[PDB]
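Components:
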Amino acid sequence: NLNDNYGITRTEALNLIKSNPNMLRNFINQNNPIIRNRIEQLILQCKL
Amino acid sequence: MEVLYSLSKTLKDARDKIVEGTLYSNVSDLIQQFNQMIVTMNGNDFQTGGIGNLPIRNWTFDFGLLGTTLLNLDANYVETARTTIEYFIDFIDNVCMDEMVRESQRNGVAPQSEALRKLAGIKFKRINFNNSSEYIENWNLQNRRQRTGFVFHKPNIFPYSASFTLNRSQPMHDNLMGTMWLNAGSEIQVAGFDYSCALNAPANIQQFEHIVQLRRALTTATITLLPDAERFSFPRVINSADGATTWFFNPIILRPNNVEVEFLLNGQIINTYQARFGTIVARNFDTIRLSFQLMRPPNMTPAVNALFPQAQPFQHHATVGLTLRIESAVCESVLADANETLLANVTAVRQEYAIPVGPVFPPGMNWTELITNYSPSREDNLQRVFTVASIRSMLIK
Amino acid sequence: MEVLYSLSKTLKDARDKIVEGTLYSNVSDLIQQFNQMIVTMNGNDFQTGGIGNLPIRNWTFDFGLLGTTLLNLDANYVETARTTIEYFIDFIDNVCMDEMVRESQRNGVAPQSEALRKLAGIKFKRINFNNSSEYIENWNLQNRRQRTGFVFHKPNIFPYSASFTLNRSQPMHDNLMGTMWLNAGSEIQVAGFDYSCALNAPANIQQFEHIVQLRRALTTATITLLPDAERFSFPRVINSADGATTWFFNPIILRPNNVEVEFLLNGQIINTYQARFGTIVARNFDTIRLSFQLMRPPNMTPAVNALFPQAQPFQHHATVGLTLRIESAVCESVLADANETLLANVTAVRQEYAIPVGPVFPPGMNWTELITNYSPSREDNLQRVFTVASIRSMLIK
Amino acid sequence: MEVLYSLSKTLKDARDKIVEGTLYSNVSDLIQQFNQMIVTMNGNDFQTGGIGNLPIRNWTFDFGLLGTTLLNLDANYVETARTTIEYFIDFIDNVCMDEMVRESQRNGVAPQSEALRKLAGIKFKRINFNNSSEYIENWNLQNRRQRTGFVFHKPNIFPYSASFTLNRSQPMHDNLMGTMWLNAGSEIQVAGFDYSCALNAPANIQQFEHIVQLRRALTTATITLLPDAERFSFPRVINSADGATTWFFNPIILRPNNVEVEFLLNGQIINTYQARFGTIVARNFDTIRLSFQLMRPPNMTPAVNALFPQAQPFQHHATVGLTLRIESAVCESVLADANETLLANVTAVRQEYAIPVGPVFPPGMNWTELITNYSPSREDNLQRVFTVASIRSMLIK
Amino acid sequence: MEVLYSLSKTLKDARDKIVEGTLYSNVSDLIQQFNQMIVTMNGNDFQTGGIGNLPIRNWTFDFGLLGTTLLNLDANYVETARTTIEYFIDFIDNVCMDEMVRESQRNGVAPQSEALRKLAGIKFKRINFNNSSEYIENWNLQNRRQRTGFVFHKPNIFPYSASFTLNRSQPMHDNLMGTMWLNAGSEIQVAGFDYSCALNAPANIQQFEHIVQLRRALTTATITLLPDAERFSFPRVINSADGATTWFFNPIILRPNNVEVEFLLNGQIINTYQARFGTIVARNFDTIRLSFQLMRPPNMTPAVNALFPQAQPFQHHATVGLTLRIESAVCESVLADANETLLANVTAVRQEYAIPVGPVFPPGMNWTELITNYSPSREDNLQRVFTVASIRSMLIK
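Structure:
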């Protein structure tokens, strides 16, 4: 979804695949809805 | 068959352009091609019909060429014309009906109905006028095989199917969980439900999934995705899966949270849309994998609290729905629509004469059964009859 | 009016084909047609309007012919052609509006709007270009005695009506039985209901029937039939038939078993389908007869048993429904559609200038009351204004 | 862009009309146009792509003119036609994709895609063939304004927005009164609810009003208005306005009385209807004001009296709703529909190649956000890409 | 494809007839054919492969003619002819290999392998030499649509199936009755077994019936029918139907008495044989009924009396059986055999290069799954690949 809609560069895409905190925090700083939604989904999954 | 379409097109253009008072410059080329049609169809006798109740009828062609000296059409010209065009249209209509009714299992694309087999001969190649209609040009591409495409408004790709699955069940049917769906025409209405409101589910989240397998992959489709499926949002009683007893359930509709829609092409995740309602689009897809969740509401007004108890009774049953309308699509194979009158024409021509059931098509051309099993021979015959119905509908509306 | 369609055709073709850089061979015949139109229309005083708020307009033509000595069109040519074409397009717009805003009880197919009478004159027959569009095709085919046909996507054949018939009632309204229905647009939605859940019915099977009587026949209609009519599947407080009190309705939705749908023409069973939901076909039908059965479930979970008692109270009312949508049909008489935009066009042209309510059409051109009684004169006038609206829409939007 | 459309039209007409056995009189003009196209494109070099994954390609044209010394076309002619036309079609497809994938916040009408920019020179005006399609015709008219309009079937003019307002409320949400609505695509469904059934309203009548502000004016619209908003006629639990808690909702559907619908343009009422259902029209409207009322029924059967008490509890909540479908309309600017696949093609072309989000359009061509914020720059870019997709669809499907 | 077979035929004839010392009288027409072939094939460039691991190969033909002056062939002629012939044989081998690895869901009988598609053009039609082999003959007939026939020795019409039905069952499986069968290749081995040896049966005769449905109708088939099915005439331990437990089968082989075989075409009697073993003929048939009887012996020596008691245990288990071989047959559609090697060739060619599992065929081209579902599309593709493999076998083994 993210690559198809928000066109990403090779470097950012590769680092997201590698789960690089640098690019993950960069994307959250950009505040894009796909990443925001997924992170909120994980935090919700932490409900216990 | 391209010859048959050319005959239909030139007869239509004769009916339209050859009118009283028109300039001859407007119809010079048309009259020349009409004369080619007349002269190349002279002498060739044709036979049509002899299946079902469709009557055997014999056609013979001996007509005079339309005049060309006239610089402005008048009553005499047009009435002699219409005398010719009436007979020609009758011939074309009977040929189209006949080719619709007949069927074949091997070599379905090729013509049946010896009238059309003879028309496919090389003598009748000089009638080819132009192949501009969407159906005839897709047919030409298939013959010249390349990437064909039909634009369908609201295709009835989904077989009719109303059903459910229970992932938790017991003979009392007092505490259930599962999914329940209708696929009909261009609509998927899928509702997951749980009586306990995800009480003992992990994180108070009950996952639901639904996989709908199309038979042909739709290209560049626009899809309206909404929440809260309607048909599964009112209290109803449903026969058990075995069919012995019946179980009642009383929906309370809930927000479907973190809903996801995946569009797949042979297990190939081609599109994914997460928590995005409204209109969406799929590039190319053969399966639709919907997923959603029933989240127990963490905070509750006393009304909803009494509505959802922690005890056993569960007098109201939580549900979450989704509704998926394929508003438009592009499909390689031929399909019926809400905007086209090809399936209706073929079925009417079959029924009006009571054709015996074919070796290929289902009895009565019931679309649900025709599309549930849509093997390539069936597809080929369907394309043939649909294209013949386009050719006929050009003249006999 | 064939002359009017000819003028609109050639003017749209002139606004299209005559552009910068086109070869002259692309537009030779069209230029000849345009020159013939100019020569015929020169020195002719036309008048338009004079009704309601349409202002009187006078039209005079002294225009030069379009030249030919060139070998590829350039800017200046299209400038002069544009100067002529805009004026002609305005003239056609005003003539079409004037003809749409008029009616006639006697001879409704003949032309009103004296400009169109003058166009119908013998001199202007020289302009008749061709008759290609579906509406002018049908106009010619019905001006002669032939069979016409208009293809419609979701035709609003049905006049809007929501109502109910109670086959059993009493003042407390605590034990009712009957049917409710909504006919609207191309939707039928009929829901039979029984408060006793066929407890006392013979063999515990209550038979509901609903007969819908189209105002005009339809041909080769694709029909989406589904069970469980949605809009009568939820609680309501319905006024009584006479309007004295209001009675409560509280559905629990069963399944309509052995549904049967008979499509009848002139009172003979043209088609019949039993327990076959999904897409179906009606080749010819002036009425639709739906007949479904609310069967009390023989076996029953304790929950459904609690819902349905043997005693009087009946706090939940058992219902079974059917939805029936005419997706696409064919009719010999003009109708409004979801696709076409002619009813809106004519109504807008009338009420923009506030034309007085005439004799034949209802006040405000409301389709419900136009089709509730659809006499031959009203049909003729509707066809005339619709075809003229198509003529207008060829140019003006 | 007119040149690009002319390329596509001549290639489509070449692929269709140039078929075996067709008379040269049928295709003389088309052959002349094709030869002009060949001579103009000959001895040139174009480059296409270089954004996202759409890869760079280079096009070079050295093709011979089609023959002209033949009275009746044969097979060996159509093979040369193939070898030319297939290459030309591929070139046009890639030009259209390249033009679609680009953007510009400023002067978006002028072509991006240096290939198309080169095509917009002076050497290529000689290819201009004829601009017949709706999109190209409106392109010409808009680029030199005459009044224009695209006719749309069920246009998704609203953005997906489902929400609710409470005119009366409590923290425990026992006694509410307000409205809920869902605007999606061409559907407005609005239901006003009162938990006390207007017990303490003035004259036992509660007034509900809903305003819908179209982002762009619609003209000659056809609107199907019916009562009983479907989506808000079953029980639900809804997250609160703040989101802290959830409140129960349990409709009992009363009818909406003295419903008024006002279609306004620029603040003044253009059309108004009262208690009119079924199909209606809207001449030229920018906003819709749906006013309706919840009247407590004066006479009440024992069941409804039990439903509606005078004390606070209110186990059942009265509601009255409306549904409104814009079946078709005419818009000066462009919108997506349910009949046209232009938006789907644009989005698919961008998605397959993963174009970086540009200055103007939203991410992934999200139509909801795009119609929510529809500034003129965005409108111009949308019109450009839509007309380019219209050109592309004439050849590639 | 006819041209491909002609290529193979002329190469085989060249390699068998252009040998040292042979007169020109014996090879004159062959030299003429080969020279026509050379003149046609000169100056062309074919590409073969690119699917799976079959390597790409480019073939270019520039070969001089063969001499037509020598009275009696000598050495040098043979080496020139051979250096041409090896290249041509390699070309045809690779064309056939690449053709056998490509399927087509639509239009199976048409060629694939762009090299072969090029060969199917108008240029290469002068290579048509001779169409003599059975497979090319039937290919020509089908393209010339009419009756076709392939004669087979041991045709494997029967998909592999080993299975049993029990008409009397207990959880202990102590007293069973029913039938078992192995259909495999061209063998039907059926065995009807009763544990009670027909104690309570009507007249001490137990009736057994077994119906076998060929997926394609066979014709003029010699069938050898013997009693005493071998594979079900010794101790065995068979798992229950669901697989839960296992039961014991301890045969004693009574005679099969008043047996009766019915060969049926489309549900009517075509042949019947009663108590007739050895060699029989099925004229034309699509299904087989094997109906026989386990008749208790009325007279028994004490050994047999001890074998079959009236009591509970039933140690030894009476049974009868039939064996039915289809020694040869004729089928209208192509099938695998034990004489031909075409299935082996195609499967080997796919396995050698590891072609990905294609649209139509099952994985590994296993004949049991291929024939259990033998759809018309599969039949088209199977005929194509079998014909190509038969063409290849003319040169390569």
